[PDB]
Amino acid sequence: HGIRMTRISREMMKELLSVYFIMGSNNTKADPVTVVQKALKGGATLYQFREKGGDALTGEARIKFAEKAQAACREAGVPFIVNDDVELALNLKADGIHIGQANAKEVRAAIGDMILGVAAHTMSEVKQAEEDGADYVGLGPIYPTTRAVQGVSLIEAVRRQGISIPIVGIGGITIDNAAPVIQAGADGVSMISAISQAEDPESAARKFREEIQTYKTGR
Numbered sequence: 001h002g003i004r005m006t007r008i009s010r011e012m013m014k015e016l017l018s019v020y021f022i023m024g025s026n027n028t029k030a031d032p033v034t035v036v037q038k039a040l041k042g043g044a045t046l047y048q049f050r051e052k053g054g055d056a057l058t059g060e061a062r063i064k065f066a067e068k069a070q071a072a073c074r075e076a077g078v079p080f081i082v083n084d085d086v087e088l089a090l091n092l093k094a095d096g097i098h099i100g101q102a103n104a105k106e107v108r109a110a111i112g113d114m115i116l117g118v119a120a121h122t123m124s125e126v127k128q129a130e131e132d133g134a135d136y137v138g139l140g141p142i143y144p145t146t147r148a149v150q151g152v153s154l155i156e157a158v159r160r161q162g163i164s165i166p167i168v169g170i171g172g173i174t175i176d177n178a179a180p181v182i183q184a185g186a187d188g189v190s191m192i193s194a195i196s197q198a199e200d201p202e203s204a205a206r207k208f209r210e211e212i213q214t215y216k217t218g219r
Contacts, residue, residue, distance in 0.1 A: 001077070001078075001079045001095050003093070004095075004112070004113040004114060004115075005113060006113055007113050007133075007135065008113075008115055008135050010164065010165070010166055013115070013135050013136050013166040013187075014166045014187035014188070015045065015187075016045050016046045016079060016188075017045070017046060017136060017166055017167070017168040017186075017187045017188030017190075018045040018046075018187070018188040018189075018209070018212050018213070018216070019043055019044045019045045019046070019188065019189065019191075019205060019208045019209050019212055020044070020045065020046045020047075020048065020168050020188055020189065020190035020191070021036075021039045021040075021044040021046070021047050021048070021190070021191065021192075021195055021196075021205065022047075022048040022050050022083070022190055022191065022192050023035065023036060023039075023047070023048070023049075023050060023192060023195075023196050024049070024050045024051040024052065024056055025051060025055075025056060025057050025065060026051075026053075026054045026055050026056050027050075027192050027193065027196045027197070028196040028197055029197070030201075032065060032069070033065070033068045033069060033072060035195075035196055035201050036069050036072050036073075037072045037076075038200075038201040038202040038205070039195050039196075039201050039202070039204075039205045040072060040073065040075075040076035040078055040205075041076070041202050041205070042195075042201065042202040042203060042204065042205025042206040042208075042209065043205045043206045043208065043209030043210075044076075044078065044195070044205045044208075044209075045078060045188070045209070046078060046079055046081060046188075047069070047073050047078055047079070047080055047081065048081040048082070048083055048098055048117075048190070049066050049069050049070070049080065049081065049082050049083060049094075050083035050098075051065065051066070051083075052083070052084070063088070066082070066088060066092060067092065070092055070094065073095075079095035079096065079115065080092075080094050080095050080096075081094065081095060081096045081097065081098050081115060081117065082094045082096070082097050082098070083097075083098050083099075084097070084098070084099055084100070084102065085097070086107060086110055086111065089111065089114065090110070090111065094114070095114065095115055096111070096114045096115025096116060096117065096135070097111060097114065097115070097116060097117070098116075098117035098118070098119070098138065099116075099117070099118055099119070100118075100119040101118075101119060101120070101121070101125060104116070104118050104128070104129060104132035104133065104134060105132045105133065108132060108133035108134075115135050115136075116133060116134050116135050116136075117134065117135065117136045117137070117138055117168075118132070118134040118136075118137055118138070119137070119138045119139075119140075119170070120137040120138065120139055120154075121139070121140075121147050121150065121154070122154070123154065123157055123158065123161070125137075126139070126154070126158050126163065126165065127163075129165075130163070130165050134165070135166065136165065136166035136167065136168060136187075137165055137166070137167055137168075138167075138168050138169075138170045138190060139154050139155050139158070139167055139168070139169060139170065139186070140169055140170035140171035141170065141171025141172060142155075142169050142170065142171045142172065142173060142177075142181055143171055143172030143173060143174075143177055144171075144172050145171065145172045145193075149171065149172075152169070152180055152181055152183075152184035152186075155167060155169065155181070155184040155185050155186050156184050156185060158185070159184075159185035166187050167185065167186045167187050167188075168186060168187060168188045168189065168190050169181035169182075169184075169186045169188070169189045169190065170189075170190045173189045173190065173191045173194060174191070174194045175194060175204070175207050175208060175211060178208065178211060178212065178215075179211065179215050182212060182215040182216055182219055183215060183218075183219045185219075187216075188212060188216075189208070189212065191208070194208070195208070
């Protein structure tokens with residue numbers, strides 16, 4: 001994954017979303033970078049650097065953590081996505097950015113052909129995200145852990161309308177409840193604590209990788 005000169009293909013985007021690990025230093029009691037390395041070794045297909053709020057690192061310390069997480073992704077051959085921070089994404093030459101409901105059109109203009117993910121909670125937001133230039137949408141919260149839990153209702157609705165945009169499920173996803181997200185039509189699942197707080201992050205990631213592959217084939 002180098003510097004993109006064209007928008008990512010939907011086929012490739014959908015494969016990357018399979019096991020999408022999201023993490024910040026405040027999401028684990030272990031060493032942050034080590035957890036990311038283990039998640040990647042186990043099978044995570046995409047990683048999102050989300051370092052904000054609470055007791056998250058700030059300033060130069062946060063930037064250095066980002067550099068190390070990015071280096072871990074490079075070694076695993078997995079794309080490195082940054083949450084909300086456009087400047088950081090550009091500065092580090094990240095593979096993309098993920099934003100929540102931020103002006104998507106403005107972000108797309110600022111990042112060229114980098115990967116752009118947009119959190120969507122309604123049909124309109126999904127449609128708008130697509131027209132704004134999003135490469136994928138994150139739908140949820142599917143399960144409980146801010147927004148109202150919606151299960152897989154929106155994922156189903158989007159597919160029923162014939163929309164084929166890459167979709168990743170978000171919100172309280174665990175190895176036990178991930179299958180229905182894929183069965184509903186999602187292209188992958190995203191998780192935080194299911195891997196970040198696991199006693200064995202590598203095995204947890206591997207289990208997700210095996211499970212998701214099986215269900216993507218079976219649905």
